[PDB]
Swiss-Prot record, chain A:
Predominant location category: cytoplasm
Origin superkingdom: Bacteria
Originating species: Escherichia coli (strain K12)
Functional description taken from the UniProt entry: Involved in the succinylase branch of the L-lysine biosynthesis and in the biosynthesis of the pentapeptide incorporated in the peptidoglycan moiety. Catalyzes the stereoinversion of LL-2,6-diaminopimelate (L,L-DAP) to meso-diaminopimelate (meso-DAP).
Active-site residues per Swiss-Prot or TrEMBL entry: C73 (proton donor), C217 (proton acceptor)
Protein name (Swiss-Prot/TrEMBL): Diaminopimelate epimerase
Taxonomic lineage: Bacteria, Pseudomonadati, Pseudomonadota, Gammaproteobacteria, Enterobacterales
Gene: dapF
Family: Belongs to the diaminopimelate epimerase family.
Disruption of the gene: reported phenotype: Cells lacking this gene show an unusual large LL-diaminopimelic acid (LL-DAP) pool and an important variations of the LL-DAP/meso-DAP ratio incorporated in the peptidoglycan.
Recorded GO CC terms: cytosol
Length: 275, 274
Protein backbone atom coordinates (compact mmCIF):
# COMPACT_ATOMS: atom_id res chain seq x y z
CA UNK A 1 0.00 0.00 0.00
CA UNK A 2 1.32 3.45 -0.91
CA UNK A 3 1.25 6.05 1.84
CA UNK A 4 2.71 9.49 2.57
CA UNK A 5 4.11 10.83 5.80
CA UNK A 6 2.96 14.38 6.63
CA UNK A 7 2.61 16.80 9.53
CA UNK A 8 0.85 19.98 10.44
CA UNK A 9 3.42 21.65 12.78
CA UNK A 10 4.67 18.36 14.26
CA UNK A 11 1.22 16.65 14.37
CA UNK A 12 2.03 13.62 12.23
CA UNK A 13 -0.08 11.51 9.92
CA UNK A 14 0.22 8.54 7.74
CA UNK A 15 -1.86 9.62 4.79
CA UNK A 16 -3.25 7.00 2.39
CA UNK A 17 -4.86 7.42 -0.99
CA UNK A 18 -7.93 5.09 -1.03
CA UNK A 19 -9.03 6.40 -4.47
CA UNK A 20 -6.45 4.70 -6.68
CA UNK A 21 -5.72 1.58 -4.59
CA UNK A 22 -7.73 -0.69 -2.27
CA UNK A 23 -7.10 0.27 1.30
CA UNK A 24 -8.05 -2.30 3.94
CA UNK A 25 -7.63 -1.82 7.73
CA UNK A 26 -8.49 -3.54 11.03
CA UNK A 27 -8.20 -1.78 14.42
CA UNK A 28 -5.27 -4.09 15.17
CA UNK A 29 -3.45 -3.35 11.91
CA UNK A 30 -3.76 0.45 12.55
CA UNK A 31 -2.25 -0.06 16.01
CA UNK A 32 0.64 -2.05 14.50
CA UNK A 33 1.30 0.53 11.73
CA UNK A 34 1.21 3.45 14.24
CA UNK A 35 3.95 1.80 16.33
CA UNK A 36 7.08 4.01 15.98
CA UNK A 37 9.47 1.04 16.13
CA UNK A 38 7.52 -1.82 14.64
CA UNK A 39 5.46 0.09 12.13
CA UNK A 40 5.48 3.31 10.10
CA UNK A 41 4.92 5.50 13.21
CA UNK A 42 2.22 8.22 13.37
CA UNK A 43 -0.21 9.98 15.74
CA UNK A 44 -3.11 9.55 13.32
CA UNK A 45 -4.07 7.84 10.11
CA UNK A 46 -5.73 9.87 7.38
CA UNK A 47 -7.63 7.99 4.67
CA UNK A 48 -8.55 9.93 1.52
CA UNK A 49 -11.54 8.56 -0.30
CA UNK A 50 -13.66 9.29 -3.38
CA UNK A 51 -16.76 11.37 -2.65
CA UNK A 52 -20.07 9.60 -1.84
CA UNK A 53 -22.08 12.67 -2.78
CA UNK A 54 -21.58 13.97 -6.39
CA UNK A 55 -21.52 17.49 -5.00
CA UNK A 56 -18.20 16.80 -3.20
CA UNK A 57 -14.63 16.22 -4.34
CA UNK A 58 -13.51 13.79 -1.63
CA UNK A 59 -14.38 12.22 1.68
CA UNK A 60 -11.78 11.61 4.40
CA UNK A 61 -11.69 9.85 7.67
CA UNK A 62 -9.15 9.74 10.47
CA UNK A 63 -8.20 7.02 12.91
CA UNK A 64 -6.04 7.42 16.02
CA UNK A 65 -3.11 5.17 17.00
CA UNK A 66 -5.58 2.99 18.92
CA UNK A 67 -7.42 2.14 15.72
CA UNK A 68 -10.55 4.10 16.38
CA UNK A 69 -12.18 6.82 14.31
CA UNK A 70 -11.66 10.48 15.36
CA UNK A 71 -14.26 13.17 14.67
CA UNK A 72 -12.72 16.63 15.37
CA UNK A 73 -13.43 19.62 13.12
CA UNK A 74 -10.37 20.57 11.08
CA UNK A 75 -8.29 17.62 12.23
CA UNK A 76 -5.95 16.58 9.37
CA UNK A 77 -7.59 19.12 7.00
CA UNK A 78 -4.42 20.91 5.91
CA UNK A 79 -2.48 17.68 5.24
CA UNK A 80 -5.56 16.41 3.42
CA UNK A 81 -5.72 19.41 1.07
CA UNK A 82 -2.02 19.41 0.15
CA UNK A 83 -1.99 15.59 -0.22
CA UNK A 84 -4.75 15.44 -2.88
CA UNK A 85 -2.89 18.11 -4.89
CA UNK A 86 0.60 16.55 -4.41
CA UNK A 87 -0.75 13.15 -5.43
CA UNK A 88 -2.50 14.55 -8.50
CA UNK A 89 -5.93 13.40 -7.33
CA UNK A 90 -7.08 16.97 -8.06
CA UNK A 91 -5.71 20.27 -9.15
CA UNK A 92 -8.53 22.29 -7.55
CA UNK A 93 -7.55 24.98 -5.06
CA UNK A 94 -10.99 25.08 -3.43
CA UNK A 95 -11.77 21.52 -2.33
CA UNK A 96 -15.19 20.33 -1.16
CA UNK A 97 -14.94 17.45 1.28
CA UNK A 98 -17.14 15.42 3.61
CA UNK A 99 -15.74 14.23 6.94
CA UNK A 100 -17.05 12.68 10.20
CA UNK A 101 -18.02 16.32 11.06
CA UNK A 102 -20.00 17.24 8.00
CA UNK A 103 -18.93 19.05 4.89
CA UNK A 104 -16.67 21.95 4.30
CA UNK A 105 -14.60 23.68 1.68
CA UNK A 106 -10.82 23.83 2.12
CA UNK A 107 -8.73 26.43 0.32
CA UNK A 108 -5.07 26.16 -0.65
CA UNK A 109 -3.57 29.64 -0.74
CA UNK A 110 -1.07 31.28 -3.10
CA UNK A 111 1.68 30.36 -0.63
CA UNK A 112 0.53 26.75 -0.42
CA UNK A 113 -0.90 27.11 3.11
CA UNK A 114 -4.38 25.80 3.80
CA UNK A 115 -7.38 27.79 5.10
CA UNK A 116 -9.84 25.83 7.21
CA UNK A 117 -13.31 26.96 8.37
CA UNK A 118 -13.35 25.89 12.01
CA UNK A 119 -17.01 26.84 12.67
CA UNK A 120 -18.19 29.34 15.26
CA UNK A 121 -16.51 29.33 18.71
CA UNK A 122 -19.05 28.31 21.32
CA UNK A 123 -18.61 30.05 24.68
CA UNK A 124 -21.57 28.44 26.44
CA UNK A 125 -20.24 26.72 29.54
CA UNK A 126 -22.57 23.71 29.08
CA UNK A 127 -21.25 23.24 25.53
CA UNK A 128 -17.64 23.05 26.69
CA UNK A 129 -18.42 21.32 29.06
CA UNK A 130 -17.37 23.62 31.88
CA UNK A 131 -18.98 23.99 35.33
CA UNK A 132 -19.76 27.70 35.76
CA UNK A 133 -22.74 29.81 36.78
CA UNK A 134 -23.04 31.28 33.27
CA UNK A 135 -20.99 32.45 30.26
CA UNK A 136 -18.51 35.13 31.29
CA UNK A 137 -15.65 36.74 29.41
CA UNK A 138 -13.29 35.91 32.33
CA UNK A 139 -13.57 33.26 35.03
CA UNK A 140 -11.76 32.81 38.35
CA UNK A 141 -10.34 29.33 38.93
CA UNK A 142 -8.14 27.88 41.69
CA UNK A 143 -4.99 25.92 41.04
CA UNK A 144 -3.99 24.99 44.61
CA UNK A 145 -2.27 28.20 45.81
CA UNK A 146 -2.75 30.36 42.69
CA UNK A 147 -5.73 32.39 41.51
CA UNK A 148 -6.08 31.87 37.70
CA UNK A 149 -8.04 34.20 35.39
CA UNK A 150 -9.07 32.46 32.18
CA UNK A 151 -11.52 32.40 29.30
CA UNK A 152 -13.24 29.13 28.33
CA UNK A 153 -14.54 28.15 24.88
CA UNK A 154 -15.44 25.18 22.73
CA UNK A 155 -14.04 24.64 19.26
CA UNK A 156 -15.76 21.25 19.07
CA UNK A 157 -13.39 20.50 21.92
CA UNK A 158 -12.79 22.17 25.33
CA UNK A 159 -10.24 24.96 25.98
CA UNK A 160 -9.13 27.00 28.90
CA UNK A 161 -7.14 30.02 27.87
CA UNK A 162 -4.92 31.85 30.39
CA UNK A 163 -3.09 35.09 29.57
CA UNK A 164 0.60 35.15 30.59
CA UNK A 165 3.42 37.70 30.58
CA UNK A 166 5.83 35.38 28.74
CA UNK A 167 5.11 31.87 27.39
CA UNK A 168 8.72 30.94 28.26
CA UNK A 169 8.21 31.52 31.99
CA UNK A 170 4.61 30.23 32.11
CA UNK A 171 4.18 27.30 34.53
CA UNK A 172 2.90 24.90 31.85
CA UNK A 173 4.25 21.79 33.52
CA UNK A 174 2.82 22.50 36.92
CA UNK A 175 -0.41 24.36 36.16
CA UNK A 176 -1.28 22.37 32.99
CA UNK A 177 -1.99 19.01 34.65
CA UNK A 178 -3.96 20.66 37.42
CA UNK A 179 -6.23 22.51 35.01
CA UNK A 180 -6.28 19.72 32.38
CA UNK A 181 -8.33 17.36 34.59
CA UNK A 182 -9.75 19.93 36.96
CA UNK A 183 -13.10 18.91 38.48
CA UNK A 184 -14.74 21.85 36.66
CA UNK A 185 -13.98 20.27 33.27
CA UNK A 186 -15.95 16.96 33.29
CA UNK A 187 -14.37 15.94 29.98
CA UNK A 188 -10.94 17.50 30.76
CA UNK A 189 -9.61 20.54 28.81
CA UNK A 190 -6.82 21.81 26.63
CA UNK A 191 -5.02 24.47 28.64
CA UNK A 192 -3.60 27.43 26.66
CA UNK A 193 -0.97 29.87 27.96
CA UNK A 194 -1.29 32.94 25.83
CA UNK A 195 1.13 35.84 25.66
CA UNK A 196 -0.32 38.89 23.85
CA UNK A 197 2.55 40.47 21.95
CA UNK A 198 0.25 42.98 20.26
CA UNK A 199 -3.35 42.97 19.02
CA UNK A 200 -2.38 41.02 15.87
CA UNK A 201 0.21 38.61 17.41
CA UNK A 202 0.30 36.13 20.24
CA UNK A 203 2.66 33.44 21.43
CA UNK A 204 1.03 30.27 22.70
CA UNK A 205 1.84 27.10 24.57
CA UNK A 206 -0.81 24.40 24.97
CA UNK A 207 -1.12 21.60 27.55
CA UNK A 208 -3.38 19.23 25.63
CA UNK A 209 -6.20 17.09 26.90
CA UNK A 210 -4.66 13.66 27.68
CA UNK A 211 -1.33 14.40 25.93
CA UNK A 212 0.33 17.27 27.84
CA UNK A 213 2.37 19.87 25.98
CA UNK A 214 2.92 19.35 22.25
CA UNK A 215 4.56 21.47 19.51
CA UNK A 216 1.27 22.76 18.14
CA UNK A 217 -2.43 22.44 18.92
CA UNK A 218 -4.43 23.96 16.08
CA UNK A 219 -7.80 24.11 17.85
CA UNK A 220 -6.01 25.59 20.88
CA UNK A 221 -4.66 28.37 18.61
CA UNK A 222 -8.27 28.98 17.45
CA UNK A 223 -9.52 29.04 21.05
CA UNK A 224 -6.87 31.39 22.36
CA UNK A 225 -7.63 33.93 19.63
CA UNK A 226 -11.42 33.60 20.06
CA UNK A 227 -10.98 34.19 23.83
CA UNK A 228 -8.53 37.11 23.26
CA UNK A 229 -10.97 38.68 20.80
CA UNK A 230 -13.87 38.34 23.22
CA UNK A 231 -11.74 39.80 26.04
CA UNK A 232 -11.06 42.84 23.82
CA UNK A 233 -7.30 42.07 23.64
CA UNK A 234 -6.98 41.01 19.97
CA UNK A 235 -7.77 42.22 16.49
CA UNK A 236 -9.72 40.16 13.99
CA UNK A 237 -6.62 38.69 12.29
CA UNK A 238 -4.00 37.24 14.58
CA UNK A 239 -0.63 35.55 14.05
CA UNK A 240 -0.15 32.71 16.52
CA UNK A 241 3.37 31.48 17.20
CA UNK A 242 3.41 27.99 18.71
CA UNK A 243 6.56 26.02 19.59
CA UNK A 244 6.21 24.18 16.25
CA UNK A 245 5.61 27.24 14.06
CA UNK A 246 3.00 29.68 12.82
CA UNK A 247 -0.73 29.77 12.33
CA UNK A 248 -2.96 32.67 11.38
CA UNK A 249 -6.48 32.92 12.78
CA UNK A 250 -9.20 35.20 11.41
CA UNK A 251 -12.44 35.79 13.32
CA UNK A 252 -14.99 38.60 12.96
CA UNK A 253 -16.64 37.59 16.18
CA UNK A 254 -19.94 36.07 17.38
CA UNK A 255 -22.22 35.27 14.42
CA UNK A 256 -19.12 34.39 12.28
CA UNK A 257 -17.12 31.24 11.58
CA UNK A 258 -13.47 31.33 12.66
CA UNK A 259 -10.76 30.53 10.04
CA UNK A 260 -7.38 28.93 10.65
CA UNK A 261 -4.61 29.10 8.04
CA UNK A 262 -1.43 27.07 8.31
CA UNK A 263 1.20 24.83 6.65
CA UNK A 264 1.24 21.08 6.02
CA UNK A 265 4.60 19.46 5.30
CA UNK A 266 5.07 16.48 3.05
CA UNK A 267 7.89 14.46 4.68
CA UNK A 268 8.15 11.31 2.59
CA UNK A 269 6.30 8.78 0.48
CA UNK A 270 6.41 5.07 1.03
CA UNK A 271 5.12 1.58 0.41
CA UNK A 272 4.24 -1.04 2.95
CA UNK A 273 3.78 -4.68 1.88
CA UNK A 274 0.48 -5.68 3.52
CA UNK A 275 -0.74 -8.34 1.01
CA UNK B 1 16.65 9.54 -1.67
CA UNK B 2 15.24 6.06 -1.28
CA UNK B 3 15.42 4.24 1.99
CA UNK B 4 13.92 1.30 3.86
CA UNK B 5 12.58 1.13 7.37
CA UNK B 6 13.63 -2.01 9.22
CA UNK B 7 13.94 -3.37 12.79
CA UNK B 8 15.83 -6.12 14.51
CA UNK B 9 13.58 -7.09 17.42
CA UNK B 10 12.22 -3.52 17.79
CA UNK B 11 15.59 -1.86 17.32
CA UNK B 12 14.71 0.35 14.35
CA UNK B 13 16.71 1.63 11.44
CA UNK B 14 16.46 3.81 8.40
CA UNK B 15 18.63 1.93 5.86
CA UNK B 16 20.00 3.59 2.71
CA UNK B 17 21.62 2.28 -0.45
CA UNK B 18 24.65 4.54 -1.06
CA UNK B 19 26.00 1.99 -3.59
CA UNK B 20 23.62 2.73 -6.51
CA UNK B 21 22.52 6.21 -5.33
CA UNK B 22 24.43 9.40 -4.57
CA UNK B 23 23.44 9.97 -0.94
CA UNK B 24 24.69 12.92 1.15
CA UNK B 25 24.41 13.50 4.96
CA UNK B 26 25.25 16.12 7.55
CA UNK B 27 24.89 15.73 11.33
CA UNK B 28 21.95 18.13 11.26
CA UNK B 29 20.14 16.30 8.44
CA UNK B 30 20.45 12.99 10.35
CA UNK B 31 18.97 14.67 13.45
CA UNK B 32 16.02 15.96 11.41
CA UNK B 33 15.41 12.61 9.66
CA UNK B 34 15.57 10.69 12.98
CA UNK B 35 12.88 12.93 14.46
CA UNK B 36 9.77 10.80 14.78
CA UNK B 37 7.34 13.66 14.01
CA UNK B 38 9.30 15.86 11.58
CA UNK B 39 11.30 13.15 9.84
CA UNK B 40 11.22 9.41 9.03
CA UNK B 41 11.76 8.31 12.68
CA UNK B 42 14.46 5.83 13.76
CA UNK B 43 16.96 4.99 16.48
CA UNK B 44 19.85 4.65 14.03
CA UNK B 45 20.73 5.25 10.38
CA UNK B 46 22.52 2.49 8.46
CA UNK B 47 24.27 3.51 5.26
CA UNK B 48 25.33 0.73 2.84
CA UNK B 49 28.47 1.50 0.83
CA UNK B 50 30.84 0.01 -1.75
CA UNK B 51 33.76 -1.98 -0.38
CA UNK B 52 36.74 -0.42 -2.26
CA UNK B 53 38.33 -3.88 -1.87
CA UNK B 54 37.73 -7.03 -3.92
CA UNK B 55 37.91 -9.18 -0.77
CA UNK B 56 34.72 -7.45 0.46
CA UNK B 57 31.11 -7.03 -0.76
CA UNK B 58 30.13 -3.93 1.15
CA UNK B 59 31.08 -1.43 3.81
CA UNK B 60 28.46 -0.04 6.18
CA UNK B 61 28.35 2.68 8.74
CA UNK B 62 25.85 3.55 11.40
CA UNK B 63 24.79 6.87 12.83
CA UNK B 64 22.74 7.47 15.95
CA UNK B 65 19.83 9.92 16.21
CA UNK B 66 22.26 12.71 17.37
CA UNK B 67 23.98 12.34 14.03
CA UNK B 68 27.19 10.73 15.26
CA UNK B 69 28.81 7.52 14.07
CA UNK B 70 28.30 4.36 16.19
CA UNK B 71 30.80 1.53 16.48
CA UNK B 72 29.21 -1.40 18.40
CA UNK B 73 29.87 -5.06 17.44
CA UNK B 74 26.96 -6.71 15.54
CA UNK B 75 24.97 -3.44 15.55
CA UNK B 76 22.60 -3.30 12.51
CA UNK B 77 24.21 -6.41 10.95
CA UNK B 78 21.02 -8.40 10.37
CA UNK B 79 19.07 -5.47 8.90
CA UNK B 80 22.10 -4.76 6.67
CA UNK B 81 22.22 -8.32 5.39
CA UNK B 82 18.53 -8.68 4.55
CA UNK B 83 18.54 -5.15 3.09
CA UNK B 84 21.28 -5.90 0.53
CA UNK B 85 19.49 -9.12 -0.47
CA UNK B 86 15.96 -7.67 -0.58
CA UNK B 87 17.18 -4.75 -2.69
CA UNK B 88 19.07 -7.03 -5.17
CA UNK B 89 22.43 -5.35 -4.30
CA UNK B 90 23.80 -8.87 -3.76
CA UNK B 91 22.48 -12.43 -3.94
CA UNK B 92 25.20 -13.95 -1.78
CA UNK B 93 24.27 -16.25 1.16
CA UNK B 94 27.61 -15.35 2.86
CA UNK B 95 28.25 -11.60 2.66
CA UNK B 96 31.64 -10.06 3.41
CA UNK B 97 31.49 -6.64 5.00
CA UNK B 98 33.74 -4.10 6.65
CA UNK B 99 32.34 -1.89 9.43
CA UNK B 100 33.63 0.47 12.12
CA UNK B 101 34.48 -2.71 14.12
CA UNK B 102 36.53 -4.53 11.44
CA UNK B 103 35.47 -7.16 8.90
CA UNK B 104 33.14 -10.10 9.10
CA UNK B 105 31.06 -12.51 7.10
CA UNK B 106 27.29 -12.49 7.60
CA UNK B 107 25.17 -15.49 6.62
CA UNK B 108 21.54 -15.24 5.47
CA UNK B 109 19.81 -18.57 6.37
CA UNK B 110 17.17 -20.57 4.48
CA UNK B 111 14.53 -19.16 6.83
CA UNK B 112 15.53 -15.54 6.18
CA UNK B 113 17.38 -15.14 9.46
CA UNK B 114 20.86 -13.75 9.72
CA UNK B 115 23.77 -15.38 11.54
CA UNK B 116 26.33 -12.98 12.96
CA UNK B 117 29.83 -14.01 14.09
CA UNK B 118 30.12 -11.99 17.30
CA UNK B 119 33.76 -13.13 17.88
CA UNK B 120 35.08 -15.04 20.92
CA UNK B 121 33.64 -13.94 24.34
CA UNK B 122 36.43 -12.42 26.48
CA UNK B 123 36.11 -13.35 30.18
CA UNK B 124 39.28 -11.51 31.22
CA UNK B 125 38.31 -8.88 33.82
CA UNK B 126 40.70 -6.22 32.53
CA UNK B 127 39.07 -6.56 29.07
CA UNK B 128 35.56 -5.85 30.30
CA UNK B 129 36.51 -3.57 32.16
CA UNK B 130 35.61 -5.21 35.55
CA UNK B 131 37.51 -4.97 38.85
CA UNK B 132 38.25 -8.48 40.30
CA UNK B 133 41.27 -10.52 41.37
CA UNK B 134 41.18 -12.86 38.36
CA UNK B 135 38.80 -14.47 35.82
CA UNK B 136 36.22 -16.61 37.65
CA UNK B 137 33.15 -18.53 36.43
CA UNK B 138 31.08 -16.92 39.22
CA UNK B 139 31.77 -13.71 41.16
CA UNK B 140 30.18 -12.51 44.38
CA UNK B 141 29.09 -8.86 44.11
CA UNK B 142 27.30 -6.58 46.55
CA UNK B 143 24.37 -4.41 45.50
CA UNK B 144 23.76 -2.63 48.78
CA UNK B 145 22.56 -5.31 51.25
CA UNK B 146 21.92 -7.87 48.53
CA UNK B 147 24.44 -10.56 47.71
CA UNK B 148 24.62 -11.17 43.89
CA UNK B 149 26.19 -14.19 42.15
CA UNK B 150 27.04 -13.33 38.56
CA UNK B 151 29.26 -14.05 35.59
CA UNK B 152 30.97 -11.21 33.76
CA UNK B 153 32.08 -11.17 30.09
CA UNK B 154 33.02 -8.84 27.26
CA UNK B 155 31.30 -9.15 23.89
CA UNK B 156 33.15 -6.08 22.60
CA UNK B 157 31.12 -4.34 25.33
CA UNK B 158 30.69 -5.04 29.11
CA UNK B 159 28.11 -7.50 30.56
CA UNK B 160 27.12 -8.72 33.98
CA UNK B 161 24.86 -11.82 33.91
CA UNK B 162 22.72 -12.86 36.91
CA UNK B 163 20.68 -16.05 37.07
CA UNK B 164 17.11 -15.49 38.27
CA UNK B 165 14.16 -17.79 39.08
CA UNK B 166 11.78 -15.83 36.80
CA UNK B 167 12.58 -12.87 34.57
CA UNK B 168 9.15 -11.33 35.30
CA UNK B 169 9.88 -11.10 39.04
CA UNK B 170 13.56 -10.13 38.66
CA UNK B 171 14.28 -6.73 40.30
CA UNK B 172 15.46 -5.15 37.05
CA UNK B 173 14.35 -1.66 37.95
CA UNK B 174 16.15 -1.60 41.27
CA UNK B 175 19.23 -3.87 40.87
CA UNK B 176 19.78 -2.82 37.23
CA UNK B 177 20.69 0.79 38.07
CA UNK B 178 22.82 -0.17 41.07
CA UNK B 179 24.73 -2.77 39.08
CA UNK B 180 24.87 -0.75 35.78
CA UNK B 181 27.02 1.91 37.43
CA UNK B 182 28.68 -0.23 40.09
CA UNK B 183 32.10 1.01 41.18
CA UNK B 184 33.44 -2.38 39.94
CA UNK B 185 32.55 -1.46 36.38
CA UNK B 186 34.77 1.55 35.49
CA UNK B 187 32.90 2.01 32.19
CA UNK B 188 29.52 0.77 33.48
CA UNK B 189 27.89 -2.49 32.35
CA UNK B 190 24.91 -4.09 30.65
CA UNK B 191 23.11 -6.12 33.28
CA UNK B 192 21.36 -9.30 32.16
CA UNK B 193 18.79 -11.16 34.24
CA UNK B 194 18.69 -14.71 32.90
CA UNK B 195 16.10 -17.36 33.67
CA UNK B 196 17.13 -20.86 32.68
CA UNK B 197 14.01 -22.68 31.33
CA UNK B 198 15.95 -25.63 29.90
CA UNK B 199 19.57 -26.12 28.91
CA UNK B 200 18.47 -25.10 25.35
CA UNK B 201 16.20 -22.24 26.42
CA UNK B 202 16.51 -19.05 28.45
CA UNK B 203 14.42 -15.99 29.07
CA UNK B 204 16.36 -12.75 29.35
CA UNK B 205 15.93 -9.19 30.42
CA UNK B 206 18.71 -6.60 29.97
CA UNK B 207 19.22 -3.30 31.77
CA UNK B 208 21.39 -1.54 29.24
CA UNK B 209 24.40 0.62 29.87
CA UNK B 210 23.31 4.27 29.69
CA UNK B 211 19.77 3.30 28.59
CA UNK B 212 18.02 1.08 31.14
CA UNK B 213 15.72 -1.71 30.13
CA UNK B 214 15.35 -2.41 26.46
CA UNK B 215 13.14 -4.85 24.52
CA UNK B 216 16.18 -6.56 22.89
CA UNK B 217 19.95 -6.28 23.37
CA UNK B 218 21.67 -8.82 21.06
CA UNK B 219 25.07 -8.54 22.69
CA UNK B 220 23.34 -9.20 26.06
CA UNK B 221 21.83 -12.39 24.66
CA UNK B 222 25.29 -13.54 23.52
CA UNK B 223 26.80 -12.69 26.93
CA UNK B 224 24.12 -14.50 28.96
CA UNK B 225 24.54 -17.60 26.87
CA UNK B 226 28.36 -17.31 27.03
CA UNK B 227 28.15 -17.06 30.88
CA UNK B 228 25.58 -19.87 31.17
CA UNK B 229 27.69 -22.16 29.01
CA UNK B 230 30.78 -21.35 31.10
CA UNK B 231 28.90 -21.89 34.35
CA UNK B 232 27.89 -25.38 33.11
CA UNK B 233 24.19 -24.42 32.82
CA UNK B 234 23.54 -24.31 29.13
CA UNK B 235 23.81 -26.39 25.97
CA UNK B 236 25.95 -25.18 23.04
CA UNK B 237 22.85 -24.01 21.12
CA UNK B 238 20.41 -21.85 23.10
CA UNK B 239 17.07 -20.22 22.31
CA UNK B 240 17.00 -16.75 23.98
CA UNK B 241 13.63 -15.12 24.59
CA UNK B 242 13.86 -11.33 25.03
CA UNK B 243 10.83 -9.04 25.41
CA UNK B 244 11.14 -8.04 21.75
CA UNK B 245 11.43 -11.68 20.56
CA UNK B 246 13.77 -14.59 19.78
CA UNK B 247 17.50 -14.97 19.20
CA UNK B 248 19.42 -18.20 18.85
CA UNK B 249 22.98 -18.34 20.20
CA UNK B 250 25.52 -21.03 19.33
CA UNK B 251 28.96 -21.37 20.99
CA UNK B 252 31.39 -24.29 21.36
CA UNK B 253 33.37 -22.53 24.11
CA UNK B 254 36.92 -21.14 24.62
CA UNK B 255 38.87 -20.93 21.34
CA UNK B 256 35.59 -20.51 19.38
CA UNK B 257 33.56 -17.63 18.00
CA UNK B 258 30.02 -17.24 19.26
CA UNK B 259 27.27 -16.93 16.65
CA UNK B 260 24.01 -14.99 17.07
CA UNK B 261 21.14 -15.80 14.69
CA UNK B 262 18.12 -13.55 14.52
CA UNK B 263 15.42 -11.86 12.50
CA UNK B 264 15.41 -8.54 10.59
CA UNK B 265 12.06 -7.16 9.56
CA UNK B 266 11.53 -5.16 6.42
CA UNK B 267 8.76 -2.69 7.45
CA UNK B 268 8.44 -0.32 4.45
CA UNK B 269 10.28 1.40 1.63
CA UNK B 270 10.18 5.10 1.10
CA UNK B 271 11.44 8.15 -0.72
CA UNK B 272 12.31 11.41 0.93
CA UNK B 273 12.64 14.54 -1.16
CA UNK B 274 16.08 16.15 -0.66
Amino acid sequence: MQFSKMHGLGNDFMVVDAVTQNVFFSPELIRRLADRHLGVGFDQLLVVEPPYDPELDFHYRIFNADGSEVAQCGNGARCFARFVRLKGLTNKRDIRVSTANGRMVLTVTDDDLVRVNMGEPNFEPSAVPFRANKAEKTYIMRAAEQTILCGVVSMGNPHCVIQVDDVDTAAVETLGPVLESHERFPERANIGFMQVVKREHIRLRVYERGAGETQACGSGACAAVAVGIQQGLLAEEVRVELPGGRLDIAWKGPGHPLYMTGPAVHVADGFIHLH
